[PDB]
């Protein structure tokens, strides 16, 4: 079952024949994507007795949102006996295809809730965003503040990280780390990547399982707050740093400059693996060590954990 392979055929889009349409967006006045914040998209509709297997309807989802969040592939929930199975198209919209249930049922009505997440590429910056979703002529709008908040900082050591592209079938994940986003001077900077202490974590961190790329940021303004990163905007300095794997499930990166200090941010993109023989918990700790001008040794660390949500969908009807 792959989201890269779709199937079509007989049937007609009966979106505009949906009766009793209501749409809603459940969220707070503020959404914090990096604190596992999300919204709920709610939908209700009556289906025409006229409907037959293969007829489709379209739920319009805005580019400011995606449905996959921290995982790499979105699963839209089936409306339930299965009334309708759904799929995500190239625009991000959800096309549902009605089953056989509707070939012999009448007065059919349904409900749907889908978790949705602020998309990092389309909402790169903190700020208000009007979210719009709908079905046919019925659109709902909700204007919300998207707040990506702030990196962590202790003395002259700044760091934050994000996790996405969690793929529980190929056993991989991505982690994107901003090192020194404060634009501090740091001397003898060292980054270590670990499992989060005393927490169930199934990351395998080592030279075979963990691909690390390091980008130098010559213009901090180019950094998104969402942690979307396109490597083409920055300088790839992977080959000039020291990357090693000094302890079980730990990596270490020394920036190793000629004057043994950094004055700019660095982005570290970690493409790693999950332990196939496990529940696949992901709890990580990223630690930035460094001296200040006074040569007192300090570290700041950032923890990454994740949450998972499921939508639902129910439908009733009567034998004709």
């Amino acid at each position: 079952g792959s989201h890269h392979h779709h199937h079509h055929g007989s049937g007609t889009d009966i979106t505009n024949q949906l009766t009793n349409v209501t749409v809603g967006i459940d969220s707070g006045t503020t959404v914090y994507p990096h604190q596992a914040g999300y919204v709920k998209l709610n939908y209700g509709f009556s289906v025409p007795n006229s409907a037959v297997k293969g007829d489709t309807f379209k739920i319009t989802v805005p580019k400011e949102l995606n449905l996959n969040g921290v995982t790499s592939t979105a699963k839209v929930p089936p409306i339930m006996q299965v009334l309708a199975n759904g799929v995500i198209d190239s625009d991000g919209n959800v096309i549902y295809t009605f089953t056989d249930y509707v070939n012999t049922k009448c007065d059919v009505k349904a409900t749907l809730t889908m978790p949705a997440y602020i998309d990092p590429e389309n909402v790169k910056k903190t700020g208000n965003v009007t979210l719009a979703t709908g079905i046919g002529s019925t659109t709902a709008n909700k204007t919300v503040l998207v707040d990506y908040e702030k990196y962590g900082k202790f003395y002259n050591l700044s760091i934050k990280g994000t996790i996405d592209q969690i793929d529980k079938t190929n056993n991989t994940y991505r982690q994107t780390i901003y090192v020194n986003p404060s634009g501090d001077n740091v001397i003898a900077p060292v980054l270590t990547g670990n499992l989060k202490p005393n927490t169930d974590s199934n990351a395998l961190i080592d030279q075979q399982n963990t691909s690390i790329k390091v980008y130098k940021v010559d213009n901090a303004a180019d950094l998104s707050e969402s942690y979307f990163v396109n490597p083409e905007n920055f300088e790839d300095v992977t080959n000039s740093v020291n990357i090693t794997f000094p302890n079980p499930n730990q990596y270490k990166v020394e920036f190793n400059t000629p004057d043994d200090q950094i004055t700019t941010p660095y982005i570290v993109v970690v493409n790693g693996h999950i332990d196939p023989n496990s529940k696949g918990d992901l709890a990580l700790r990223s630690t930035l060590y460094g001296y200040n001008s006074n040569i007192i040794w300090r570290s700041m660390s950032w923890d990454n954990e994740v949450a998972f949500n499921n939508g639902s969908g129910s439908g009733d009807g009567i034998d004709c």
Epitope: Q208, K213, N239, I243, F245, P246, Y289
Partner: antibody, heavy 121, light 113 residues
Framework: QVQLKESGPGLVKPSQTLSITCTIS????????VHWVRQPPGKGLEWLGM???????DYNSALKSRLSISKDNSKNQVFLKMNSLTAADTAVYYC???????????????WGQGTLVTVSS | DIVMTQSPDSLAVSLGERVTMNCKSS????????????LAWYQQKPGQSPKLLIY???TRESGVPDRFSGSGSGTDFTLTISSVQAEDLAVYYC????????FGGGTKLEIKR
């Protein structure tokens, strides 16, 4: 010029603690990590552990329970301590330090002359 | 633990000839992201500390003679002496530094007669 010299006892009983000192010159200990590595008579080399400039230590997993590494930047001294000794800990003990940044890694470029410790009753 | 094994324990050499030594690792020491092989070779004489000859598999250390070269990639590596001299009689150890620090059991050169 960067230098390292190991001093210690020559002989140590198995009831006792091994205590070695590495005296450092030509660089600041707070800016460089120093390694410990050992070599039994007629055998190969074994990394024991390291102390970072900032004071963190990493140990060889097989000896961490019996091993402690510490230092005094003030005095240019690095210390190695080992308890629960057997004849297998009779070895030449070395301290060592990496090359300058352009080497691209933290390894063993500058070595001390080493100091033989033999465990015996 | 990446384990390092050197194939010929002892090697009989003719002063002037081409000596090659093998070293093998139980897992790859080529990290795919930077394409570097985290491998070094050391020389040791009987009462002295080891001396770095070669690092990153093929980068000759300053001061080391041009007759020494290193090759290989991944899990198989070689130390060559173009033509062996009196001072080359010693022990040679390989070593990896990608996953902590480990050494091979070494290869002793002796004179053939």
């Amino acid at each position: 010029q960067v230098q390292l010299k190991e001093s210690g006892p020559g002989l140590v009983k198995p009831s006792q603690t091994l205590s070695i000192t590495c005296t450092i010159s030509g660089f600041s200990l707070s800016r460089y990590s120093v390694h410990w590595v050992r070599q039994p008579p007629g055998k190969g080399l074994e990394w024991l552990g390291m102390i970072w400039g900032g004071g963190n230590t990493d140990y060889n997993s097989a000896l961490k329970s019996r091993l402690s590494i510490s230092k005094d930047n003030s005095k240019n001294q690095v210390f190695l301590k080992m308890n629960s000794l057997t004849a297998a800990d009779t070895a030449v003990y070395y301290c060592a330090r990496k090359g300058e940044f352009y080497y691209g890694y933290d390894g063993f470029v500058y070595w001390g002359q080493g100091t033989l410790v033999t465990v015996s009753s | 633990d990446i384990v390092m094994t050197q194939s010929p324990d002892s090697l009989a050499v003719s002063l002037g000839e081409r000596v090659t030594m093998n070293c093998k690792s139980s897992q790859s020491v080529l990290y795919s992201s930077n394409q570097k092989n985290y491998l070094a070779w050391y020389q040791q004489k009987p009462g002295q500390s080891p001396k770095l000859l070669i690092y990153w598999a093929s980068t000759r250390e300053s001061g080391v003679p041009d007759r020494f070269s290193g090759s290989g990639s991944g899990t198989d590596f070689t130390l060559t002496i173009s033509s062996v001299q009196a001072e080359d009689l010693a022990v040679y150890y390989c070593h990896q530094y990608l996953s902590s620090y480990t050494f091979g059991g070494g290869t002793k050169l002796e004179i053939k007669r």
